[model samples]
Target: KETAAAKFERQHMDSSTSAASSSNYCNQMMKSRNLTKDRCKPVNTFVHESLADVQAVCSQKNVACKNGQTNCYQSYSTMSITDCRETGSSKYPNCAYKTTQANKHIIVACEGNPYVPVHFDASV
Candidate 1:
């Protein structure tokens, strides 16, 4: 079974890629990264920073998560990220996404002994 932190990486991390290219970035990434295995994920954000940097957020400012959990933390620095949104015409097994890149402070829910990110809460 995959740990929450590992799942978070699979869903959100994209550190090595430079500026996550082209309009097809989402379409290709969403499928290749295993996000489109079942139903299309409505929206997702990929962070263009190292895992160590993101993991450090767990030790940053504590905040309330959308789900009311107090374990969430907001990053102290703005980070490069790409948002992948499923297009209106997208369908299961043929999921499509529109990519939008930006720099923003991200919020994530963290847990466990090492206190790593478990869920991507928001970006602001």
Candidate 2:
């Protein structure tokens, strides 16, 4: 079984991508990453940074998560990221998405013995 940390990486990490081909990027990635299978993920984000760098966010100052948990931490530096939102006409098994790229500070929830990120809470 995959750990939450690993799943988070699989869903969010994409270090090599650029905004040049981002439109097709979401359409391809959403399916390839398994976000579009039985159902479409309404929205998602891809971080254009190294896994190690992202994991390091756990060591930053703690903040509250979306659900009011305090294990979340915000990235100190602005990061390159792409936001993927499903079009209204999109449906299951064919999840089409609109890609928007930007630089923002990401917030993630960390957990476990080593305290790594387990969830992507938000961006600011």
Candidate 3:
């Protein structure tokens, strides 16, 4: 079984990706990362910035989580990200996605030693 931490990295971390050509990035990533195996993960986010910078988000400004959890922090810098959205025409085992590249401050939940990002709360 994949650990939560590993899954988090695989789904969201993409330090080497350039600012461009990320539209198709999500489609391939979502599939390759196993987010579309059992069923499609309707909405997914991938950070195209460095891992260190992403981990530092825990030390950034705080925000109230939409789920009412008081454990979210918003990134200070506008980071490169790819948003993978499931198309309405998608069907299980044959999922299709609409990929979009956007620059936004990400919101993440932090926990554990060194307090790295644990969950992608949202993006703004």
Leading candidate by lDDT: 1
As for candidate 3, its clashing pairs are none
Instruction: Give the residue spans of candidate 3 off by over 4 A.
Output: 20-22
Q: Give the distance in Å from residue 115's predicted Cα in candidate 3 to where it truly belongs.
A: 0.8
State in Å the error of residue 11, model 2.
0.7
- Candidate 2 C-alpha error for residue 120, in Å: 0.4
Tens-digit per-residue lDDT, 6-114, candidate 2? 8998899999865425467889888999999779999999999988989999998689998998899999999888889999999787789998899999999999988
Candidate 3, poorest ten consecutive residues by summed lDDT: 18-27
Give the per-residue lDDT digits (tens) of candidate 1, residues 1-124. 9988889999999998856768888898889889999789899999999999999999998999999979999999999999999999997989988999888999999999988999999999
TM-score computed on alpha carbons, candidate 3 = 0.92
Sequence-dependent TM-score of model 2:
0.95
Clashing pairs in 1: none
By lDDT, the better pick of 1 and 2 is 1
Candidate 2 ranges with C-alpha deviation above 4 Å: 18-20
As for TM-score, the candidate ahead, 1 or 2, is 1
Q: Please provide TM-scores, in order, for all candidate models, with all chains considered together.
A: 0.96, 0.95, 0.92
- Pitting candidate 1 against candidate 3, the one with the higher lDDT is 1
TM-score of 1: 0.96
**Model 3 over residues 1-124: C-alpha lDDT tens digits?**
9766676798789887755474566668888989999898899988988888998899999999888988899999899988889999988887788888889999998877767787998998
